[PDB]
Copies of this chain bind each other. A is one copy, B any other.
Amino acid sequence: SEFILTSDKLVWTYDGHKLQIEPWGENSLRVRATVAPELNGNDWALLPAKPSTKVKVSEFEDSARIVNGNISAVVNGRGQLSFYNQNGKLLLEEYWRTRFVAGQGEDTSSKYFSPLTHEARELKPIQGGKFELRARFESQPDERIYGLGQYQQPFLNVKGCTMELAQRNSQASVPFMMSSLGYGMLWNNPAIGEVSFANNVTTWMARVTEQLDYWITAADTPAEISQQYAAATGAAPMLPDYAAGFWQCKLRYRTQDELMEVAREYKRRSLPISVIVADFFHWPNQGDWCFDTREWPDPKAMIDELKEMGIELMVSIWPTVDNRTENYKIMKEKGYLVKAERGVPVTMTFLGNTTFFDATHPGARKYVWEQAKKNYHDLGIKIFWLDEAEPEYSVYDFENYRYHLGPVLEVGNIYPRGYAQAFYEGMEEAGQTEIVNLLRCAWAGSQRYGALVWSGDINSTFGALRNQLMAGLNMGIAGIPWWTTDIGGFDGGDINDPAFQELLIRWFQWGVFCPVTRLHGFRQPMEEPAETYRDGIAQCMTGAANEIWSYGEDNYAIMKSCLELRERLRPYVMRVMKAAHDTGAPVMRPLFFDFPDQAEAWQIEDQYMFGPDILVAPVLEAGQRSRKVWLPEGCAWIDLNTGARQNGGQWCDCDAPLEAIPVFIREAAAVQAELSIALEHH
């Protein structure tokens, strides 16, 4: 084996395998490995690193070492790699089980000595092709793991869980993890695959790839890790003011008159409303990207009236292009569409045979943006709903599809980032600042393209609500601070069912304390279109009403006070949004983000912090009217609902009537006054 060492780079080589470790931001290292002649030029989610001045490269015995601030990497003579912090504590070590490695006998006194023959950096050649990559690391008994994106599962800590590295409706792979051991790690590789944080071994897998690529950072607090990650992959922009208010939506307002009636009724009742939404199939065909003027006769007039009312319109964008449209003909000519490797050249069959635009193709991004610009942005629409962002193949046979940047197996997970990029870059070029679009999916770095992500088409149950809480917290840790849900869930809520009405209330109450407060759903009983087809184009149904007055008088009163509460929170929300932009901190965050020195903060998964000053303890079960709440040590807490003061460092058997969830304010935080919390003496 051979080291090639310079003052700021460590390369190890043996039999064509090249391992390269280098600084990539303060307290951070990038790690690449290949068996090709050279590393390629793909940086994926990593921005160019601002240089590190005090990088120390050294050799000792048969080993080499690279130190960059609070992280160091050691590679021994056998090419085996481990990472340490400034205190010499082991952060992460490769998993090797061999008797012979890098042309040398393995040391029989090591746990690495084994006839099993597993390598830590397995670049397994695909016959005729590239490589199937497994990167193996030792599991650690104390290790708790967070981030990875948005998964539909009741686990905040994902140690012992296995996550698919793929994009499907209601899932988002954003592969940055944060460890309780004091490091964060980005898997800087958009290949379809899997990460297993199994108790016995950690394995990251890429189905098809040219090389291993990851980024690792070390710091004493979660806040510092989140900041270092945002410096590596990009900060969220500043959120525009309107986005902190109430977003009203449903599947679907079918006509201009129907949408405007709802907007006007909100104003007629003196209710807060910042954003109203025209959902999908408001267009003539998929891939036209314009209003159908039979249902939407004068969209400019709608937008102008809504502006006068203080309301922004957001419109559904679908990435689908129906093969009967004019844009299909042009986009096919130009090579701007995704391709099927085998079988009929159709990627989705929903209400027509469509092909997704290729969001990895720079030309296709520009083309789609310029259509949305002409037909929507030029009329005054400032927010786009980038739906189906995965994209939602009718069948998730990732092997069967190919993009501009290569087979979906190799590059597929970056699609939603390109989709966000198309609109963000277009809107920025058109002169807009503080851009936010609603994205169903993301990859590493999507935050830099103003991606407000929502958790997609989940069912309307308490089980779903519990999953969304974990998912949103993990999305924030993965560097996606702008995140939300369909208040009430998407599918299955009957507006006349008491059981659903109870869920809607609990979900709405939680929603007040989400980064964005957004009511959406496909409510029952659903209504079929008058005509199944029109001119051969299949017509889209609607669900039932989904406004805060649609669920009876008692529920209206609760939701109205939720809206009023959210308006009072807006100044605080904007401060926390500014902090996300400045520091990479999430908006909704696990307890350990603000209280990393407290053991309960690393164990509790049903409470969180909404910024630094609000402790939230959602009600996640039907019929529940009280719950246990841990109040962190280090300050006093003001009960939002009673005005009562409680000392930190204790548990509360807290009241949780249907009318409110337990919420506490850090005593004397500016937000306490902004909420007008008072206690009356009767």
Contact = CB atoms under 8 A, between A and B. Distances in A.
Contacts of A396: 117
B198 A161 contact: yes
Given A329-B103, A397-B342, A407 B128 contact: yes
A340 interface: yes
B162 A201 contact: yes
Pick the most buried of A129, A340, A392: most chain B CB atoms within 10 A of its CB.
A129
B400 A343 contact: yes
B2 A333 contact: yes
A16 B335 contact: yes
A273 interface: no
A170 interface: yes
A115 B168 contact: yes
Contact of A399 (B127, B151, B153, B162): B127
A461 B15 CA distance: 30
A538 B537 CA distance: 10
B129 A160 contact: no
B394 A15 contact: no
A375 interface: no
B168 A459 contact: no
Pick the most buried of A343, A404, A458: most chain B CB atoms within 10 A of its CB.
A343
A545 to B, nearest CB: 18
Interface string A164-184: 000011110000000000000
Contact of A126 (B108, B128, B339): B128
A37 interface: yes
Contacts of A2: 333
Main DSSP-derived SS at the A contact region: loop
A332 interface: yes
A208 B536 contact: no
A82 interface: no
A200 interface: yes
Contact of A459 (B113, B125, B207): B113
A135 to B, nearest CB: 15
Nearest to A207: B128
A533 interface: yes
A208 B399 contact: no
A161 B117 CA distance: 19
B353 A128 contact: no
Contacts of A348: 344
B109 A200 contact: no
Contact of A111 (B339, B343, B461): B461
Contact of A394 (B103, B344, B347, B459): B344
Nearest to A340: B343
Given A13-B335, A335-B16, A535-B533, A152 B116 contact: yes
Interface string A130-166: 1000000000000000000001110100101111000
Interface string A98-127: 010001000011110111110000000111
A8 interface: no
A459 B114 contact: yes
A434 interface: no
A400 to B, nearest CB: 4
A199 B160 CA distance: 6
Contacts of A491: 99, 108, 113
Interface string A572-589: 000000000000000000
Contacts of A343: 340, 342-344, 346, 395, 397, 400
B200 A198 contact: no
B170 A115 contact: yes
B115 A169 contact: yes
B400 A200 contact: no
Given A114-B170, A114-B458, A171-B116, A125 B333 contact: no
A428 interface: no
A169 B116 contact: yes
B492 A208 contact: no
A359 to B, nearest CB: 15
B407 A200 contact: no
B128 A15 contact: no
A349 B333 CA distance: 20
A362 to B, nearest CB: 9
A491 B97 CA distance: 14
A474 interface: no
Interface of A: 1-2, 13-17, 37, 97, 99, 103, 108-111, 113-117, 125-130, 151-153, 155, 158, 160-163, 168-171, 196, 198-201, 203, 207-208, 329, 332-335, 337, 339-349, 353, 392, 394-397, 399-400, 402, 404-405, 407, 409-410, 456-461, 463, 491-492, 532-533, 535-536, 538
17 contacts: A15-B333, A37-B405, A108-B460, A115-B170, A115-B392, A116-B171, A127-B342, A127-B399, A127-B407, A128-B208, A128-B409, A128-B410, A129-B130, A155-B199, A342-B395, A343-B344, A532-B535
Given A127-B341, A344-B348, A532-B536, 7 more contacts: A1-B333, A103-B329, A116-B168, A161-B199, A161-B200, A343-B343, A533-B533
